[PDB]
Write an enzyme that holds these catalytic residues in place. Structure first.
Site, PDB file in Angstrom:
ATOM      1  N   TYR A  20      -6.908   1.431   7.920  1.00 49.96           N
ATOM      2  CA  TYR A  20      -6.716   2.068   9.202  1.00 49.96           C
ATOM      3  C   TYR A  20      -8.028   2.028  10.000  1.00 49.96           C
ATOM      4  CZ  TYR A  20      -2.311   4.169   7.656  1.00 49.96           C
ATOM      5  OH  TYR A  20      -1.012   4.359   7.243  1.00 49.96           O
TER       6      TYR A  20
ATOM      7  N   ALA B  67       0.836  -1.218   0.000  1.00 53.15           N
ATOM      8  CA  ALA B  67       0.000   0.000   0.000  1.00 53.15           C
ATOM      9  C   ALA B  67       0.861   1.255   0.000  1.00 53.15           C
ATOM     10  CB  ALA B  67      -0.925   0.008   1.207  1.00 53.15           C
TER      11      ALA B  67
ATOM     12  N   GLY C 201       9.910  -3.239   3.390  1.00 54.06           N
ATOM     13  CA  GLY C 201      10.945  -2.337   3.843  1.00 54.06           C
ATOM     14  C   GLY C 201      12.300  -2.636   3.196  1.00 54.06           C
TER      15      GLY C 201
ATOM     16  N   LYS D 211      -0.239  -5.428  10.141  1.00 52.70           N
ATOM     17  CA  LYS D 211       0.868  -4.757   9.415  1.00 52.70           C
ATOM     18  C   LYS D 211       1.546  -3.733  10.292  1.00 52.70           C
ATOM     19  CE  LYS D 211       1.588  -1.921   5.188  1.00 52.70           C
ATOM     20  NZ  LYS D 211       1.932  -0.607   5.711  1.00 52.70           N
TER      21      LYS D 211
ATOM     22  N   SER E  97      -4.168   0.906  -0.568  1.00 52.51           N
ATOM     23  CA  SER E  97      -4.190   1.857   0.529  1.00 52.51           C
ATOM     24  C   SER E  97      -5.579   2.309   0.902  1.00 52.51           C
ATOM     25  CB  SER E  97      -3.412   3.107   0.137  1.00 52.51           C
ATOM     26  OG  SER E  97      -3.447   4.034   1.245  1.00 52.51           O
TER      27      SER E  97
ATOM     28  N   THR F 116      -3.213  -1.756   9.481  1.00 50.39           N
ATOM     29  CA  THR F 116      -1.964  -1.104   9.902  1.00 50.39           C
ATOM     30  C   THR F 116      -2.032  -0.715  11.343  1.00 50.39           C
ATOM     31  OG1 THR F 116      -1.630  -0.379   7.640  1.00 50.39           O
ATOM     32  CG2 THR F 116      -0.458   0.833   9.396  1.00 50.39           C
TER      33      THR F 116
ATOM     34  N   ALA G 130       0.043   5.397  -0.510  1.00 48.56           N
ATOM     35  CA  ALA G 130      -0.967   6.407  -0.747  1.00 48.56           C
ATOM     36  C   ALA G 130      -0.732   7.261  -1.954  1.00 48.56           C
ATOM     37  CB  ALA G 130      -1.060   7.331   0.465  1.00 48.56           C
TER      38      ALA G 130
ATOM     39  N   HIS H  30       6.874   0.480   8.266  1.00 48.28           N
ATOM     40  CA  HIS H  30       6.123   1.516   7.517  1.00 48.28           C
ATOM     41  C   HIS H  30       7.048   2.246   6.545  1.00 48.28           C
ATOM     42  CE1 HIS H  30       2.038   3.647   7.879  1.00 48.28           C
ATOM     43  NE2 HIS H  30       2.620   4.343   6.923  1.00 48.28           N
TER      44      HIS H  30
END
Ligand SMILES: Cc1cc2nc3c(=O)[nH]c(=O)nc-3n(C[C@H](O)[C@H](O)[C@H](O)COP(=O)(O)O)c2cc1C
Ligand SMILES: O=C(C1CC1)N1CCN(c2ccc(F)cc2)CC1
Length: 344
Positions: free
Chosen positions: A129, A76, A274, A218, A105, A155, A78, A242
């Site tokens: 979220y 995801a 990451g 996540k 996202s 998340t 944004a 993140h």
């Protein structure tokens, strides 16, 4: 021109407005974890086996029961329409072509339904979220269910937004012709108004009761938290910092991956994101027990180059680098990528 993922970043820096490139590039604060997510992969060394017959290398695997062409999926990110006009619709179409999955996202510049319509055959999951407005939150879950998304990635590392210094300097906002379509730094202020800093494991219990879809936590970085997620009936852990955008000075995800794989005792799949830029990064993560990895920024750089085609190119480069890394390591398929392939 562009033959590796780093080349796509450099191209993107040349074509994007500075504020947009910085929004996508930045980590939190001094960006110590941003550098480490990449450096850490380099510290894990490979111990290839020779003479294993790698004429037929099969990259396919499964994420939460759904077959994918490669253990390399889109994370995801944004507001993809800032990078290319077609944004998330370009991304999902590329995923469909490649046979891999797209994590959409909650802050996308395209709707849940628009993305399902652009990639009906694509494997799609929703990143969620927990908004202070639980009605909003439930509607997103219900839409993902109705529109054929296969999992929810909740998340859990963003009770507030991290402090990304360039976004504060540039006073980051959306360009005027864009919106988040499912509803100092402008984004930090948005989060403080919309995202619930109170959430706890009790809210995970709520979300587990709300949907029968598979739920992946996540942003977990500790073994104790991973064990708690399993106890709450969640179905996977996405080991993530993140993209180094939240708390700076946490470890690299590849370094915390072994503790999390150990902690969950095989009860649920463990994923990583990451710092994945190369096929050998994918191989290292799988050797340490991840089922699959997610890529964030490389996808945005693909969009900035050429929309759908640029995303497809980036995914094909990762796929080919991964195929080569498997073959040079003596691995015919993902099932034989074992822990003795790597040492730190
Ligand atoms: C520009 C940008 C936007 C992001 N947006 C989101 C988001 O909307 N939701 C989310 O859960 N994570 C978000 N993330 C985190 C990513 O899902 C992912 O954890 C991270 O990009 C992985 O690291 P990588 O960029 O090194 O591949 C974002 C990351 C970036 C760089
Ligand atoms: O996802 C979004 C935006 C992309 C459209 N929203 C859902 C949560 N909403 C919320 C409102 C008040 C509040 F105080 C907290 C949360 C508004 C924003």
């Amino acid at each position: 021109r562009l033959i590796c993922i780093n080349d796509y970043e450099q191209h993107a820096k040349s074509v994007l407005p500075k504020s947009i490139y910085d929004y996508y590039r930045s980590g939190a604060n001094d960006e110590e974890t941003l550098a480490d997510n990449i450096a850490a992969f380099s510290r894990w060394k490979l111990y290839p086996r020779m003479l294993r017959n790698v004429a037929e290398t099969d990259l396919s695997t499964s994420v939460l029961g759904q077959r994918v062409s490669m253990p390399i999926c889109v994370g995801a990110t944004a507001m993809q329409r800032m990078a290319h006009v077609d944004g998330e619709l370009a991304t999902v179409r590329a995923c469909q072509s490649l046979g891999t999955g797209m994590m959409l996202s909650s802050w996308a510049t395209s709707s849940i339904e628009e993305v399902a319509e652009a990639g009906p055959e694509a494997l799609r999951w929703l990143q969620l979220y927990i908004y202070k407005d639980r009605e909003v939150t439930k509607k997103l879950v219900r839409q993902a269910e109705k529109m054929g998304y296969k999992a929810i990635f909740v998340t859990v590392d963003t009770p507030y937004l991290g402090n990304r210094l360039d976004d504060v300097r540039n006073r980051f906002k959306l360009p005027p012709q864009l919106r988040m379509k499912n509803f100092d730094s402008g984004l930090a202020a948005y989060v403080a108004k919309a995202i619930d800093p109170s959430i706890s494991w009790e809210d995970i219990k709520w979300l587990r009761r709300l949907t029968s879809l598979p739920i992946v936590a996540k942003g977990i970085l500790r073994g104790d938290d991973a064990r708690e997620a399993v106890k709450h009936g969640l179905n996977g852990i996405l080991v993530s910092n993140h993209g180094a955008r939240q708390l700076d000075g946490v470890p690299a995800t590849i370094d915390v991956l072994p503790e999390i794989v150990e902690a969950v005792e095989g009860k649920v799949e463990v994923f990583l994101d990451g710092g994945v830029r190369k096929g050998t990064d994918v191989l290292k993560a799988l050797a340490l027990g991840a089922k699959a990895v997610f890529v964030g920024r490389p996808i945005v750089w693909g969009l900035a180059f050429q929309g759908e085609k640029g995303v497809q190119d980036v995914l094909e480069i990762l796929k080919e680098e991964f195929r080569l890394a498997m073959a040079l390591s003596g691995c015919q398929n993902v099932k034989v990528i074992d822990k003795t392939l790597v040492r730190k």
